[PDB]
């Protein structure tokens, strides 16, 4: 005899679930016995045992016996009817990143402040079996379990959900975690990631990142380092063989400062391309410590002379960044040195040509978040003459 | 030539430090050059370069040259004059516990919210060299470094202090961490740890823990599992060969609930004994969920009958603890099962004798902290008769 449930063995709280049992095509009456608590249970070689509303009293192990003319038959295969949604959901994150190479392992972390017994990792699919881990107490408070995932083969999507339960009720689980998707990244030609805005972004500006491909990718995914999830847009192909997508991030805040990569995939493939070259988004006006800029000889100089730009601060910044107005390339970063009661970096422009003329600004930053910058220094005009 | 500092190379902020240089017993004048910043410095084959108050301008590398009749001599051994106390101190803890076996390794953890570059571990001693590690960003925020310590030989004390600094100022360190001591535990005969109070302690009661030894230990250390530090008392010997110490913990709070062990050491030895048998301190009245106690047949029973005490709760406790009034042994713990809309544990007293009569109480607890209990149930009187 067999025992199963039509919607599934994992049922959310307060939703219908039907249990079906199968005999040997000939039986007078079936009986259902929950393991331990319920003695009796009752409700065409099949029997229907409906539960209009799933509650914690129905969660447990179920067995089925069909009574034939010769007597009671063998016990059926036990069925775990799991209820979910009884506790606040856990958190689920990828340890290095949700981006993993095609093949190769990675770690997922279940996490909650109350899940001190067991965690369950479920993978989206058809006949996927859950994995259980013992919970671990963290030094800073809370509980976590680290699930090894891999090798991540690019034959299908990889989506996961976290659960926790307690020892006394093994079939009563918490609310599901937010799903997390894992992207396998291959060796296909990388896209190109370009920014439409300047090197350093003022708060409130509009930012649009643009991916493009000369091999004709249909989907594009933009991922920022250190985040849980990614963005996803379809690719536009006005001309065949050259696709592109735009990621409008709206008014920029401090959370928009970071390192960005984007990936492309074809129409019927779950494998993604190699990452683009990283793009760094810098946000000015995040630190109120001041910086100043000054030319060591002077603003007005002659060609061929030794000119040094000095960005200095009374605060102990970690690095300084020099930007030229009109320049599209990323700013030049230099570590700070401790001088005569100041912290400074020297930006050598020796020998000076006529192409070095323009407006310069400098910024300070700390290594804790090297994408959040200070307010710009007062602009400096470098004048050159033959 | 040599270069050193009398108080030491690690000097707290705003304290005197003196730098001495030694030549070839014959030199007209010594000179001191700080690496990079200061060119000149000046202030019987020795020269005294005093610093009335140590500041961050004096922190760096120093070299000494003595000028003889034949010219300048070789550069001296560079001296790293380190200033401490410039930042808030980090935290320092032992990963499993400060108790380690004699020999064998352990891990110390430096920790701060700002130490994102480097951490320094200093061991107390005469000529101990500091160890530096790169900082690691934590998922929950903050920074840490994990230092391998071992093998911990019981020839001396093991005390450590944590520091952090930044890349731009390598010789400017934070305030020292609180010192942490490591105790090597050997295979000497374990002490005995007894409690003067009952099994379960009500909040506000006085608790005194008592260690004792029949081998004549002079020092006693009491350690509670999961803590950073330990307690330490000298042992009293009214009679030779039998020492003891009392650990008065005052009015008990929730922080007094835990697992306790204590160790003993002799007068001129840094090796400690084997741990005592663990002692668990339970604190009642910490959980406001209710438990109740009832005899399944009834309070009044006859000897030889089957009697079961049932502690149950509407709340989903993890375990139940049965306490008999007057009993000195620890309470009996049983996991809870899910019943007819209740959670309960059955405490079998079948067959019942005349020694089972008395007053019984039951408590609930959760596995997150199994030493914090609920309020006691209403007392039950078990009456037996022949």
């Amino acid at each position, epitope marked *: 005899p067999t025992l199963w449930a039509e919607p599934g063995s994992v049922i959310s709280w307060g939703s219908p679930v039907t249990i079906w049992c199968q005999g040997s095509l000939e039986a007078q009456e079936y009986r259902l016995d929950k393991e331990g608590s319920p003695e009796p249970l009752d409700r065409k070689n099949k029997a229907r045992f409906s539960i209009p509303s799933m509650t914690e009293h129905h969660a447990g192990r179920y067995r089925c016996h069909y009574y034939s003319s010769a007597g009671w038959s063998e016990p059926s295969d036990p069925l775990e009817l799991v209820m979910t949604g009884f506790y606040n959901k856990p958190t689920l994150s990828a340890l290095p990143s949700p981006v993993v190479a095609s093949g190769g392992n990675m770690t997922l972390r279940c996490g909650s402040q109350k899940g001190y017994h067991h965690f369950v990792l479920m993978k989206e699919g058809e006949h996927q079996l859950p994995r259980t881990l013992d919970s671990q107490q963290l030094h800073s408070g809370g509980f976590q379990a680290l699930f090894p995932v891999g090798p991540v083969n690019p034959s299908h999507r990889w989506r996961f959900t976290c659960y926790y339960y307690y020892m006394n009720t093994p079939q009563v689980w918490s609310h599901p975690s937010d799903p997390l998707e894992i992207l396998p990244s291959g060796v296909s030609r990388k896209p190109s990631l370009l920014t439409l805005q300047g090197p350093v972004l003022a708060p409130g500006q509009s930012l649009t990142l643009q991916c493009g491909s000369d091999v004709g990718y249909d989907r594009f995914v933009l991922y920022k380092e250190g985040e849980r999830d990614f963005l996803q847009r379809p690719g536009q192909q006005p001309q065949a063989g050259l696709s592109q997508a735009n990621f409008t991030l709206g008014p920029v805040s401090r959370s928009h400062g970071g390192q960005y990569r984007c990936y492309g995939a074809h129409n019927l493939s779950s494998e993604w391309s190699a990452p683009s070259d990283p793009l760094n988004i810098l946000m000015a006006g995040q630190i109120y410590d001041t910086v100043s800029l000054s030319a060591q000889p002077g603003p007005t100089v002659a060609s061929g002379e030794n000119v040094t730009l000095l960005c200095q601060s009374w605060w102990q910044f970690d690095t300084f960044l020099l930007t030229k107005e009109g320049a599209a390339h990323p700013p030049l970063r230099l570590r700070s040195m401790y001088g005569a009661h100041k912290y400074q970096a020297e930006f050598p422009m020796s020998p000076v040509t006529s192409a070095h003329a323009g407006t310069y600004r400098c910024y300070g930053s700390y290594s804790s978040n090297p994408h959040l910058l200070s307010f710009p220094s007062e602009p400096l005009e470098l004048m050159v003459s033959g | 030539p040599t270069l050193w500092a009398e108080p030491g190379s690690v000097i707290s902020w705003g304290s005197p430090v003196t730098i001495w240089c030694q030549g070839s017993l014959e030199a007209q004048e010594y000179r001191l050059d700080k690496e990079g910043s200061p060119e000149p410095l000046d202030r019987k084959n020795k020269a005294r370069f005093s610093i009335p108050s140590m500041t961050e301008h004096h922190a760096g590398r120093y070299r000494c040259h003595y000028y003889s009749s034949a010219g300048w001599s070789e550069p001296s051994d560079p001296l790293e004059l380190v200033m401490t106390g410039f930042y*808030n101190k980090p935290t320092l803890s032992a990963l499993p516990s400060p108790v380690v076996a004699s020999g064998g390794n352990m891990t110390l953890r430096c920790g701060s919210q700002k130490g994102y570059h480097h951490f320094v571990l200093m061991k107390e001693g005469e000529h101990q060299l500091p160890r530096t590690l790169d900082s690691q960003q934590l998922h929950s925020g903050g920074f840490q470094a994990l230092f391998p310590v071992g093998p911990v030989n019981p020839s001396h004390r093991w005390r450590f202090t944590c520091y952090y600094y930044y890349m731009n100022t390598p010789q400017v360190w934070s305030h020292p961490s609180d010192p942490l001591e490591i105790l090597p535990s050997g295979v000497s005969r374990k002490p005995s740890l007894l409690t003067l109070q009952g099994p379960v302690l009500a909040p506000g009661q006085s608790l005194t823990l008592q260690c004792g030894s029949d081998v004549g230990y002079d020092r006693f250390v009491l350690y509670k599992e999961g803590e950073r530090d330990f307690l330490q008392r000298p042992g009293q010997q009214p009679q030779a060969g039998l020492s003891q110490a009392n650990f008065t913990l005052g009015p008990v709070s929730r922080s007094h609930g835990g697992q306790y062990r204590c160790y003993g050491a002799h007068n001129l030895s840094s090796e400690w004994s084997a741990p005592s048998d663990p002692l668990n301190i339970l604190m009642a009245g910490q959980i406001y969920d209710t438990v109740s106690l009832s005899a399944q047949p009834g309070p009044t029973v006859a000897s030889g009958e089957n009697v079961t005490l049932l502690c149950q709760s509407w709340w989903q406790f993890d375990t139940f603890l049965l306490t008999k009034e007057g009993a000195a042994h620890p309470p009996l713990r049983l996991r809870s099962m899910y019943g007819a809309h209740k959670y309960q544990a059955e405490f079998p007293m079948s067959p019942v004798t005349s020694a089972h009569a008395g007053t019984y109480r039951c408590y609930g607890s959760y596995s997150s902290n199994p030493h914090l209990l609920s309020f006691p149930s209403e007392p039950l009187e078990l009456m037996v008769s022949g």
Partner: nanobody
Amino acid sequence: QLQESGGGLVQAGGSLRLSCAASGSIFVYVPMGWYRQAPGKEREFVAAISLGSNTNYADSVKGRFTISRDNAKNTVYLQMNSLKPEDTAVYYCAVTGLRIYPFVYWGQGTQVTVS
């Protein structure tokens, strides 16, 4: 967090003293000082002092304002002298040099209306 004092207003050539007391965390090791807004303008830097008793002064108030610190009570003082009319602003007590987000701790503000 931060509590300010010594507000008000005076005529040209007058003198006012600002005070700022700190509570809630460790503020011994970071610089403390004043920034000021203005009608239609942004927050500039005015003055600061750190643990090593080193002072920082904006060029517009150099040699006119004096900052002092009490390391025992985490309290800083500003001694404004020769108050010019362009000092009319809302001065903010600031804890800078945090090196991490939010990089600053601001005071609720005080009004100076030198006219």
